[PDB]
Amino acid sequence: MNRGALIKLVESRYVRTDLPEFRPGDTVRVSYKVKEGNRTRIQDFEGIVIRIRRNGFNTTFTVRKVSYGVGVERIFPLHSPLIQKIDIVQRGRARRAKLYFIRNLSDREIRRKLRADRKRIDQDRAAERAA
Amino acid sequence: AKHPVPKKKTSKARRDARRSHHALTPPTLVPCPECKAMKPPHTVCPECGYYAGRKVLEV
Amino acid sequence: RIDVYRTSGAGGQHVNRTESAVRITHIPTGIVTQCQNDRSQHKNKDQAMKQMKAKLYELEMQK
Amino acid sequence: MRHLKSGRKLNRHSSHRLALYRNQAKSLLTHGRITTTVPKAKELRGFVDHLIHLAKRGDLHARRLVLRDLQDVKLVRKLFDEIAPRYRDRQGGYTRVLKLAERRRGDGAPLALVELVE
Amino acid sequence: MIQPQTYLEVADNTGARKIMCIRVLKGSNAKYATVGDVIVASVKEAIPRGAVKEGDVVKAVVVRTKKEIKRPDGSAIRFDDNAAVIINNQLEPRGTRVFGPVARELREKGFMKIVSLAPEVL
Amino acid sequence: MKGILGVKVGMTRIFRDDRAVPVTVILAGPCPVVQRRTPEKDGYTAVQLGFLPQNPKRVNRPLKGHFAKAGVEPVRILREIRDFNPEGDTVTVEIFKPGERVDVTGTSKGRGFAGVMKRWNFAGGPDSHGAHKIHRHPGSIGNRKTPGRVYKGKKMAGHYGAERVTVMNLEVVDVIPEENLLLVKGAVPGPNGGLVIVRETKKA
RNA sequence: CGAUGUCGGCUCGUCGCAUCCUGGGGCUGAAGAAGGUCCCAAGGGUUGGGCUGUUCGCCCAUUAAAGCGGCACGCGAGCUGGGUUCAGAACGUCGUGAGACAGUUCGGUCUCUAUCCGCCACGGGCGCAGGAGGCUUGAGGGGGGCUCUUCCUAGUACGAGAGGACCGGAAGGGACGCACCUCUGGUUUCCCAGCUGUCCCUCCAGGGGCAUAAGCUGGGUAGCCAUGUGCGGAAGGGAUAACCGCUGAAAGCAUCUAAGCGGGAAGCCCGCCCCAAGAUGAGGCCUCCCGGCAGCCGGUAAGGACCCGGGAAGACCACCCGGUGGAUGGGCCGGGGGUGUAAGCGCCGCGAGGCGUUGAGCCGACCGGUCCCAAUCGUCCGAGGUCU
RNA sequence: GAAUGCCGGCAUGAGUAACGAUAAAGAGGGUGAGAAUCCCUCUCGCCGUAAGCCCAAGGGUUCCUACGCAAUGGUCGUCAG
Ligand SMILES: [Mg+2]
Ligand SMILES: [Mg+2]
Ligand SMILES: [Mg+2]
Ligand SMILES: [Mg+2]
Ligand SMILES: [Mg+2]
Ligand SMILES: [Mg+2]
Ligand SMILES: [Mg+2]
Ligand SMILES: [Mg+2]
Ligand SMILES: [Mg+2]
Ligand SMILES: [Mg+2]
Ligand SMILES: [Mg+2]
Ligand SMILES: [Mg+2]
Ligand SMILES: [Mg+2]
Ligand SMILES: [Mg+2]
Ligand SMILES: [Mg+2]
Ligand SMILES: [Mg+2]
Ligand SMILES: [Mg+2]
Ligand SMILES: [Mg+2]
Ligand SMILES: [Mg+2]
Ligand SMILES: [Mg+2]
Ligand SMILES: [Mg+2]
Ligand SMILES: [Mg+2]
Ligand SMILES: [Mg+2]
Ligand SMILES: [Mg+2]
Ligand SMILES: [Mg+2]
Ligand SMILES: [Mg+2]
Ligand SMILES: [Mg+2]
Ligand SMILES: [Mg+2]
Ligand SMILES: [Mg+2]
Ligand SMILES: [Mg+2]
Ligand SMILES: [Mg+2]
Ligand SMILES: [Mg+2]
Ligand SMILES: [Mg+2]
Ligand SMILES: [Mg+2]
Ligand SMILES: [Mg+2]
Ligand SMILES: [Mg+2]
Ligand SMILES: [Mg+2]
Ligand SMILES: [Mg+2]
Ligand SMILES: [Mg+2]
Ligand SMILES: [Mg+2]
Ligand SMILES: [Mg+2]
Ligand SMILES: [Mg+2]
Ligand SMILES: [Mg+2]
Ligand SMILES: [Mg+2]
Ligand SMILES: [Mg+2]
Ligand SMILES: [Mg+2]
Ligand SMILES: [Mg+2]
Ligand SMILES: [Mg+2]
Ligand SMILES: [Mg+2]
Ligand SMILES: [Mg+2]
Ligand SMILES: [Mg+2]
Ligand SMILES: [Mg+2]
Ligand SMILES: [Mg+2]
Ligand SMILES: [Mg+2]
Ligand SMILES: [Mg+2]
Ligand SMILES: [Mg+2]
Ligand SMILES: [Mg+2]
Ligand SMILES: [Mg+2]
Ligand SMILES: [Mg+2]
Ligand SMILES: [Mg+2]
Ligand SMILES: [Mg+2]
Ligand SMILES: [Mg+2]
Ligand SMILES: [Mg+2]
Ligand SMILES: [Mg+2]
Ligand SMILES: [Mg+2]
Ligand SMILES: [Mg+2]
Ligand SMILES: [Mg+2]
Ligand SMILES: [Mg+2]
Ligand SMILES: [Mg+2]
Ligand SMILES: [Mg+2]
Ligand SMILES: [Mg+2]
Ligand SMILES: [Mg+2]
Ligand SMILES: [Mg+2]
Ligand SMILES: [Mg+2]
Ligand SMILES: [Mg+2]
Ligand SMILES: [Mg+2]
Ligand SMILES: [Mg+2]
Ligand SMILES: [Mg+2]
Ligand SMILES: [Mg+2]
Ligand SMILES: [Mg+2]
Ligand SMILES: [Mg+2]
Ligand SMILES: [Mg+2]
Ligand SMILES: [Mg+2]
Ligand SMILES: [Mg+2]
Ligand SMILES: [Mg+2]
Ligand SMILES: [Mg+2]
Ligand SMILES: [Mg+2]
Ligand SMILES: [Mg+2]
Ligand SMILES: [Mg+2]
Ligand SMILES: [Mg+2]
Ligand SMILES: [Mg+2]
Ligand SMILES: [Mg+2]
Ligand SMILES: [Mg+2]
Ligand SMILES: [Mg+2]
Ligand SMILES: [Mg+2]
Ligand SMILES: [Mg+2]
Ligand SMILES: [Mg+2]
Ligand SMILES: [Mg+2]
Ligand SMILES: [Mg+2]
Ligand SMILES: [Mg+2]
Ligand SMILES: [Mg+2]
Ligand SMILES: [Mg+2]
Ligand SMILES: [Mg+2]
Ligand SMILES: [Mg+2]
Ligand SMILES: [Mg+2]
Ligand SMILES: [Mg+2]
Ligand SMILES: [Mg+2]
Ligand SMILES: [Mg+2]
Ligand SMILES: [Mg+2]
Ligand SMILES: [Mg+2]
Ligand SMILES: [Mg+2]
Ligand SMILES: [Mg+2]
Ligand SMILES: [Mg+2]
Ligand SMILES: [Mg+2]
Ligand SMILES: [Mg+2]
Ligand SMILES: [Mg+2]
Ligand SMILES: [Mg+2]
Ligand SMILES: [Mg+2]
Ligand SMILES: [Mg+2]
Ligand SMILES: [Mg+2]
Ligand SMILES: [Mg+2]
Ligand SMILES: [Mg+2]
Ligand SMILES: [Mg+2]
Ligand SMILES: [Mg+2]
Ligand SMILES: [Mg+2]
Ligand SMILES: [Mg+2]
Ligand SMILES: [Mg+2]
Ligand SMILES: [Mg+2]
Ligand SMILES: [Mg+2]
Ligand SMILES: [Mg+2]
Ligand SMILES: [Mg+2]
Ligand SMILES: [Mg+2]
Ligand SMILES: [Mg+2]
Ligand SMILES: [Mg+2]
Ligand SMILES: [Mg+2]
Ligand SMILES: [Mg+2]
Ligand SMILES: [Mg+2]
Ligand SMILES: [Mg+2]
Ligand SMILES: [Mg+2]
Ligand SMILES: [Mg+2]
Ligand SMILES: [Mg+2]
Ligand SMILES: [Mg+2]
Ligand SMILES: [Mg+2]
Ligand SMILES: [Mg+2]
Ligand SMILES: [Mg+2]
Ligand SMILES: [Mg+2]
Ligand SMILES: [Mg+2]
Ligand SMILES: [Mg+2]
Ligand SMILES: [Mg+2]
Ligand SMILES: [Mg+2]
Ligand SMILES: [Mg+2]
Ligand SMILES: [Mg+2]
Ligand SMILES: [Mg+2]
Ligand SMILES: [Mg+2]
Ligand SMILES: [Mg+2]
Ligand SMILES: [Mg+2]
Ligand SMILES: [Mg+2]
Ligand SMILES: [Mg+2]
Ligand SMILES: [Mg+2]
Ligand SMILES: [Mg+2]
Ligand SMILES: [Mg+2]
Ligand SMILES: [Mg+2]
Ligand SMILES: [Mg+2]
Ligand SMILES: [Mg+2]
Ligand SMILES: [Mg+2]
Ligand SMILES: [Mg+2]
Ligand SMILES: [Mg+2]
Ligand SMILES: [Mg+2]
Ligand SMILES: [Mg+2]
Ligand SMILES: [Mg+2]
Ligand SMILES: [Mg+2]
Ligand SMILES: [Mg+2]
Ligand SMILES: [Mg+2]
Ligand SMILES: [Mg+2]
Ligand SMILES: [Mg+2]
Ligand SMILES: [Mg+2]
Ligand SMILES: [Mg+2]
Ligand SMILES: [Mg+2]
Ligand SMILES: [Mg+2]
Ligand SMILES: [Mg+2]
Ligand SMILES: [Mg+2]
Ligand SMILES: [Mg+2]
Ligand SMILES: [Mg+2]
Ligand SMILES: [Mg+2]
Ligand SMILES: [Mg+2]
Ligand SMILES: [Mg+2]
Ligand SMILES: [Mg+2]
Ligand SMILES: [Mg+2]
Ligand SMILES: [Mg+2]
Ligand SMILES: [Mg+2]
Ligand SMILES: [Mg+2]
Ligand SMILES: [Mg+2]
Ligand SMILES: [Mg+2]
Ligand SMILES: [Mg+2]
Ligand SMILES: [Mg+2]
Ligand SMILES: [Mg+2]
Ligand SMILES: [Mg+2]
Ligand SMILES: [Mg+2]
Ligand SMILES: [Mg+2]
Ligand SMILES: [Mg+2]
Ligand SMILES: [Mg+2]
Ligand SMILES: [Mg+2]
Ligand SMILES: [Mg+2]
Ligand SMILES: [Mg+2]
Ligand SMILES: [Mg+2]
Ligand SMILES: [Mg+2]
Ligand SMILES: [Mg+2]
Ligand SMILES: [Mg+2]
Ligand SMILES: [Mg+2]
Ligand SMILES: [Mg+2]
Ligand SMILES: [Mg+2]
Ligand SMILES: [Zn+2]
């Protein structure tokens, strides 16, 4: 038996392929389904992904934003059914995989260390040229 | 600690009794299919230098 | 209510190993009193009865 | 507990194990065959095989990689020009370990020979 | 994870600025308070002429933790500070405003005033 | 009182009703019954189940006679489910339906010879303030001259784990018959690849 | 007294019940809710902190409750050493003085190796009349045993009102326990990258040693883990405690009792989980083996051991898997995963650098595949079955 | 027959604690009855205001060489103060 393929087989039925591809340093808008009262709505949360923590179906990212003067930091399962969509708002070029370090930086300093990934931006516009 | 110490001398009987487990087991030997000398299995024959039916080692 | 416990200074294997100190507390008033002066808890229970008499003689005075 | 942990310690700290494996690889690749203790011999197999395979790849990058471990330029020439071509069609298994019959006198240590395969 | 000795920012306008937890009110021996839990705290720093003052023993609800709180949907949320809102014994906020975001769990535990007064609920 | 043999394959989590639910996956079916224990014959009622096919060259003669009498093909494990008498000659994961609630028995992970803090959650000693070579030591193990001995069952260091454990009242989240797969919610004893037994829960 | 180490703390408990809480009950100056008091009850539980060497006690914030005692006021061959109880020094006091104080003050050496009993774990031997391979029964023993809040019943019973139920249901917690690693979060001694200084290879480039037993730093798979996840306390059955009865004499009435019968606790017995036939009372079932002279000798059968490749098994031992008619480990290949765009070359810049090739290169353990390397070849044990 | 007696011998503890700085080792060759431990070569590590070099005190042949390994060397020893 192949336990890995058995796991992958149980997971196959929840795997998701519609979400766009992004990398630490990119700025991302996650439209996330949320339950309150008495309804469910969609709440956008937009920030820099500082982490993508890979394990196949079980990969998760972490997105960071400043919400009225306070740092907020959300962890999403990549394949969560509660993610309506993910929108790439900006491509940033980081020099490492984990960006914990921006927790300690002013907005200026972050904005200097994570400059626009001009290559992958050019890629994004070379695509979305639809036929 | 406070330096523990034998309370009584161990008797000859109890000494040798703990020693009931100390006898050596003889080495496990097989004949070399080449020179018929006895040797440990799964080792290169120290007498003729063969192993797996071929010369491996100057002896 | 009379409590009994060990003294707090010199004495040896004594003081350590003997409940010689007493504390008498008049329940309705809240007045507490101790004595540790001697070695017997009954010298101390004696003395603290005196001191406790005199302190309720001083409140009833203050009234 | 040692659950699913790979690699021996050989009662050496990190850098000393490293130097151990490097030196013994130099000794194999120089003489084609050495005698060591059975545990050390079993550890050599993988770390020499990596170097040989990398020599089979032959590019500059493999030479510099191998040469981090072996340091000796001449020895690495011997590796690429002379040892490696010998194993072009062999896919792994470049070394063998064969246990020796007699133990070392001073410490009773069991011994084995490590070879480059034909 | 709030426990006795932990300071928290106060996220309201009661006048307190920093409080020290001295007890998490959740059973006889809860080790930790998270979002939505109630703590008894001492006021360690306050602005002049506030509704509360330094030395006061108050109650507050934890609205924000630096230890990330897990949610049944598999997601989690984490903030940069440990924050509380000072309340009365009707769980009612004792000031008129609350500052910064608060966790959505507050809604489920019956802190409706505080949730609505919040600039953002995450 | 139904049950089946199986192997622990691994853990993941699925999404059910906008909830991440952790699951252990178990390869349970299929199990041929190779003997039945009857009150007549044996003093109780049970069914011995076989599981995992074995290379016949590894099966000795008495075991082969045992399998042959059942008209059954050599198998790696023989384990007996008590107070169960399946009506067919083969037990599969069909016996469980999602929402059913099960007890899972496995061999816990073995921690070898374990200290008193790991085995029994003792507090150990201080790590400063004069503490002398007792940072992970049990402390006192008795009294004095009365009773002048140590209780039986006194918690002390020793081997821990690699031992039968049953976890009870686990939800069957899903069953996948075409793979003989059983998704149970939560944690199951032992390592991946370990043998387990899945039974109907005794909890009401 | 040829030595029985002492206060407090820590650790680890265990026992008693004159019961702090929880469970059951009688009386109440018990309307309800909440109390008071007494009876039954030791299964489990019985918080954190300020002060002081303190036990004790006072206080803060909680709680169902913050119980009282025994065990050399349990426990220093388990720890501590703040207090008392050496030598120094000082204050007050006493003494002419040397000195002295159940008076204070600052300081002040706590001993690596467990023989026996005992305890926690693990084996070897023999036995269990024939010898083997599996699967079991459970005598007996261990574990566990807690509790709160909210909602419906119902703002109903009760009550002038405020308050506010019995019974019966539901939901969610605290602490504890067992297991687990999918998620969250750790570590991850060389898995990747960056950095300084120096010495070296080979001058450049590219690399190596050392700066720790990782030089430093940023990360980090498996594994092991909690702060993270699952689940447990039951249900139910039986016999009882206090207590409440039915029927009922002695004793025309009465009486729970003398003959009988019933109800009745978190407690008792079972039930749940784990161990367990050395249970010498050694159990049961399925299957296999069939010559020299109640002994002995030899060679074998079923089968087992040795030896070897190994293992979330493990101190050794044991256990488990595999041993060429084989995927056991090592290599190699694919995947996962970590890191985060190698070297080389080309182009831009005076240059440090930048850009492309390029998610590149490197790459432990994880999931698989592949006989390339290694488990070669073998050897030894092991029945011949006691009598009525 | 005892004096924690005196002298001596031999036991128990026990094949147990320990083998004296965690600066570190590996291989090839030689010698030899015998080699992890002696010699040689290559690789690796450590010291380098020293763990290198010179002088004084103290020590008193320990210096060099040949031939040796019973004991001394905390193992071994063909080696050595
Ligand atoms: Mg897996
Ligand atoms: Mg499949
Ligand atoms: Mg919004
Ligand atoms: Mg931002
Ligand atoms: Mg949707
Ligand atoms: Mg000690
Ligand atoms: Mg001691
Ligand atoms: Mg000791
Ligand atoms: Mg000591
Ligand atoms: Mg000692
Ligand atoms: Mg003694
Ligand atoms: Mg004898
Ligand atoms: Mg003995
Ligand atoms: Mg010869
Ligand atoms: Mg004192
Ligand atoms: Mg006393
Ligand atoms: Mg006394
Ligand atoms: Mg360890
Ligand atoms: Mg392995
Ligand atoms: Mg290694
Ligand atoms: Mg290993
Ligand atoms: Mg090993
Ligand atoms: Mg080591
Ligand atoms: Mg060693
Ligand atoms: Mg060493
Ligand atoms: Mg190390
Ligand atoms: Mg180093
Ligand atoms: Mg080193
Ligand atoms: Mg490798
Ligand atoms: Mg061999
Ligand atoms: Mg051998
Ligand atoms: Mg020797
Ligand atoms: Mg604020
Ligand atoms: Mg003030
Ligand atoms: Mg489903
Ligand atoms: Mg099992
Ligand atoms: Mg283990
Ligand atoms: Mg311990
Ligand atoms: Mg622990
Ligand atoms: Mg434990
Ligand atoms: Mg502790
Ligand atoms: Mg301490
Ligand atoms: Mg500790
Ligand atoms: Mg000390
Ligand atoms: Mg220490
Ligand atoms: Mg101890
Ligand atoms: Mg004592
Ligand atoms: Mg003692
Ligand atoms: Mg006794
Ligand atoms: Mg075990
Ligand atoms: Mg596992
Ligand atoms: Mg005495
Ligand atoms: Mg004496
Ligand atoms: Mg004596
Ligand atoms: Mg003495
Ligand atoms: Mg004594
Ligand atoms: Mg007690
Ligand atoms: Mg009583
Ligand atoms: Mg009660
Ligand atoms: Mg009551
Ligand atoms: Mg009432
Ligand atoms: Mg009333
Ligand atoms: Mg009452
Ligand atoms: Mg009464
Ligand atoms: Mg009564
Ligand atoms: Mg009790
Ligand atoms: Mg008890
Ligand atoms: Mg108690
Ligand atoms: Mg307290
Ligand atoms: Mg303080
Ligand atoms: Mg204190
Ligand atoms: Mg105190
Ligand atoms: Mg203090
Ligand atoms: Mg006191
Ligand atoms: Mg007072
Ligand atoms: Mg209360
Ligand atoms: Mg009450
Ligand atoms: Mg006591
Ligand atoms: Mg006493
Ligand atoms: Mg005490
Ligand atoms: Mg005592
Ligand atoms: Mg004591
Ligand atoms: Mg001591
Ligand atoms: Mg003490
Ligand atoms: Mg002692
Ligand atoms: Mg002791
Ligand atoms: Mg003692
Ligand atoms: Mg102390
Ligand atoms: Mg002292
Ligand atoms: Mg003092
Ligand atoms: Mg003192
Ligand atoms: Mg003193
Ligand atoms: Mg004294
Ligand atoms: Mg003194
Ligand atoms: Mg003095
Ligand atoms: Mg003074
Ligand atoms: Mg004076
Ligand atoms: Mg005086
Ligand atoms: Mg005087
Ligand atoms: Mg005078
Ligand atoms: Mg005078
Ligand atoms: Mg004095
Ligand atoms: Mg003084
Ligand atoms: Mg001092
Ligand atoms: Mg003193
Ligand atoms: Mg000490
Ligand atoms: Mg001593
Ligand atoms: Mg010893
Ligand atoms: Mg012993
Ligand atoms: Mg004894
Ligand atoms: Mg045995
Ligand atoms: Mg045995
Ligand atoms: Mg039983
Ligand atoms: Mg018995
Ligand atoms: Mg029982
Ligand atoms: Mg109502
Ligand atoms: Mg009314
Ligand atoms: Mg109810
Ligand atoms: Mg509950
Ligand atoms: Mg994992
Ligand atoms: Mg993890
Ligand atoms: Mg994870
Ligand atoms: Mg993690
Ligand atoms: Mg890891
Ligand atoms: Mg490396
Ligand atoms: Mg050179
Ligand atoms: Mg140079
Ligand atoms: Mg350079
Ligand atoms: Mg360098
Ligand atoms: Mg160097
Ligand atoms: Mg170093
Ligand atoms: Mg390094
Ligand atoms: Mg640095
Ligand atoms: Mg980290
Ligand atoms: Mg690191
Ligand atoms: Mg936990
Ligand atoms: Mg629970
Ligand atoms: Mg009546
Ligand atoms: Mg009647
Ligand atoms: Mg009767
Ligand atoms: Mg009845
Ligand atoms: Mg009855
Ligand atoms: Mg009735
Ligand atoms: Mg009944
Ligand atoms: Mg209960
Ligand atoms: Mg069993
Ligand atoms: Mg038996
Ligand atoms: Mg059995
Ligand atoms: Mg018996
Ligand atoms: Mg039997
Ligand atoms: Mg039976
Ligand atoms: Mg055979
Ligand atoms: Mg092994
Ligand atoms: Mg051994
Ligand atoms: Mg077996
Ligand atoms: Mg085998
Ligand atoms: Mg074979
Ligand atoms: Mg074969
Ligand atoms: Mg393999
Ligand atoms: Mg393989
Ligand atoms: Mg691979
Ligand atoms: Mg990959
Ligand atoms: Mg990747
Ligand atoms: Mg580049
Ligand atoms: Mg490049
Ligand atoms: Mg140029
Ligand atoms: Mg350019
Ligand atoms: Mg790969
Ligand atoms: Mg094949
Ligand atoms: Mg082969
Ligand atoms: Mg042979
Ligand atoms: Mg005499
Ligand atoms: Mg004597
Ligand atoms: Mg003597
Ligand atoms: Mg004596
Ligand atoms: Mg004598
Ligand atoms: Mg004599
Ligand atoms: Mg003498
Ligand atoms: Mg003598
Ligand atoms: Mg003797
Ligand atoms: Mg001796
Ligand atoms: Mg030994
Ligand atoms: Mg011993
Ligand atoms: Mg030992
Ligand atoms: Mg030793
Ligand atoms: Mg030492
Ligand atoms: Mg040494
Ligand atoms: Mg040689
Ligand atoms: Mg040599
Ligand atoms: Mg030698
Ligand atoms: Mg020699
Ligand atoms: Mg050496
Ligand atoms: Mg030499
Ligand atoms: Mg150096
Ligand atoms: Mg220098
Ligand atoms: Mg001279
Ligand atoms: Mg001299
Ligand atoms: Mg000389
Ligand atoms: Mg001389
Ligand atoms: Mg000279
Ligand atoms: Mg000389
Ligand atoms: Mg010579
Ligand atoms: Mg000699
Ligand atoms: Mg010699
Ligand atoms: Mg000799
Ligand atoms: Mg001679
Ligand atoms: Mg010697
Ligand atoms: Mg010697
Ligand atoms: Mg010596
Ligand atoms: Mg010689
Ligand atoms: Mg010498
Ligand atoms: Zn031969």
Swiss-Prot record, chain A:
**Similarity remark:** Belongs to the bacterial ribosomal protein bL19 family.
One GO MF term? rRNA binding
The protein's matches in Pfam families, at most eight in alphabetical order, are given as: Ribosomal_L19
Give GO terms for biological process: translation
This entry carries the following GO cellular component terms, namely:
cytosolic large ribosomal subunit
Gene giving rise to this polypeptide: rplS
Protein name from the UniProt record: Large ribosomal subunit protein bL19
User: What keywords are assigned to this protein?
Assistant: Ribonucleoprotein, Ribosomal protein, RNA-binding, rRNA-binding
Quaternary structure, per UniProt, is: Part of the 50S risobomal subunit. Contacts protein L14. Forms a bridge to the 30S subunit in the 70S ribosome, contacting the 16S rRNA.
Instruction: Give the species.
Output: Thermus thermophilus (strain ATCC 27634 / DSM 579 / HB8)
PROSITE patterns, sorted: RIBOSOMAL_L19
What's its job?
Contacts the 16S rRNA of the 30S subunit (part of bridge B6), connecting the 2 subunits.
Curated annotation (Swiss-Prot), chain B:
Q: Which SUPFAM superfamilies match?
A: Zn-binding ribosomal proteins
Which Pfam families does the UniProt entry name for this protein? Answer: Ribosomal_L32p
Disordered: region residues: 1-29
Bias (Basic residues) ranges: 1-22
Q: Which InterPro entries match?
A: Ribosomal_bL32 (IPR002677), Ribosomal_bL32_bact (IPR044957), Ribosomal_zn-bd (IPR011332)
Q: Which UniProt keywords apply?
A: Ribonucleoprotein, Ribosomal protein
Signal peptide, first to last residue: none
Q: What terms describe the molecular function in GO for this protein? A: structural constituent of ribosome
Q: Which GO terms describe its cellular component?
A: large ribosomal subunit
GO biological process terms, alphabetically, are: translation
Role, per record: Found on the solvent side of the large subunit.
Family assignment from sequence similarity: Belongs to the bacterial ribosomal protein bL32 family.
HAMAP family, alphabetized: Ribosomal_bL32
* PANTHER family, per database record: 50S RIBOSOMAL PROTEIN L32 (PTHR35534), LARGE RIBOSOMAL SUBUNIT PROTEIN BL32 (PTHR35534:SF1)
Under the subunit heading, UniProt states: Part of the 50S ribosomal subunit.
Q: What is this protein called?
A: Large ribosomal subunit protein bL32
Gene that this sequence comes from:
rpmF
From Swiss-Prot, chain C:
Q: What does its PTM field state?
A: Methylated by PrmC. Methylation increases the termination efficiency of RF2. Is absent when the factor is overproduced.
Where in the sequence is N5-methylglutamine found? Q13
Question: Where does the UniProt annotation locate this protein?
Answer: Cytoplasm
Upon changing T7A, the result is:
In strain: BL21 and MRE-600; increased termination efficiency
Motif GGQ motif, which positions?
A: 11-13
Q: Which family does it belong to?
A: Belongs to the prokaryotic/mitochondrial release factor family.
Q: What else is known?
A: This provides a mechanism for the protein to regulate its own production.
Cite the record's note on assembly.
Answer: Interacts with the ribosome. Recruited to stalled ribosomes by ArfA, in the presence of truncated mRNA, ArfA influences RF2 conformation so RF2 can hydrolyze the peptidyl-tRNA bond. Biotinylated tnaC mRNA can be detected in a stalled 70S ribosome-RF2-TnaC-tRNA(Pro) complex.
UniProt function note: Peptide chain release factor 2 directs the termination of translation in response to the peptide chain termination codons UGA and UAA. Acts as a peptidyl-tRNA hydrolase. In the presence of truncated mRNA in the 70S ribosome, ArfA and RF2 interact such that the GGQ peptide hydrolysis motif of RF2 rises into the peptidyl-transferase center (PTC) and releases the ribosome. Recruited by ArfA to rescue stalled ribosomes in the absence of a normal stop codon. A TnaC-stalled ribosome binds RF2, but the active GGQ motif is prevented from engaging with the PTC by TnaC.
Record-given protein name: Peptide chain release factor RF2
Q: Point out the gene that encodes the protein.
A: prfB
Residues of the whole record sequence present: 240 to 302 of 365
Curated annotation (Swiss-Prot), chain E:
Q: Which domain of life is it from?
A: Bacteria
Molecular function (GO) terms listed?
large ribosomal subunit rRNA binding; structural constituent of ribosome
Sorted keywords for this record are: Ribonucleoprotein, Ribosomal protein, RNA-binding, rRNA-binding
Q: Name one GO cellular component term.
A: cytosolic large ribosomal subunit
Which GO biological process categories is it annotated with? translation
- InterPro entries xrefs: Ribosomal_uL14, Ribosomal_uL14_bac-type, Ribosomal_uL14_CS, Ribosomal_uL14_sf
Provide the disulphide bond pattern. none
Pfam families the record matches: Ribosomal_L14
Question: Which stretch is the leader sequence?
Answer: none
Tell me the subunit arrangement: Part of the 50S ribosomal subunit. Contacts protein L19. Forms a bridge to the 30S subunit in the 70S ribosome, contacting the 16S rRNA.
PANTHER family recorded: 50S/60S RIBOSOMAL PROTEIN L14/L23, LARGE RIBOSOMAL SUBUNIT PROTEIN UL14M
Q: What does the sequence similarity comment in the record state about its family? A: Belongs to the universal ribosomal protein uL14 family.
Q: What task does this protein carry out?
A: This protein binds directly to 23S ribosomal RNA. Contacts the 16S rRNA of the 30S subunit in two different positions helping to form bridges B5 and B8.
Under what name is this protein listed?
Large ribosomal subunit protein uL14
Q: Which organism is it from?
A: Thermus thermophilus (strain ATCC 27634 / DSM 579 / HB8)
The gene behind this protein is: rplN
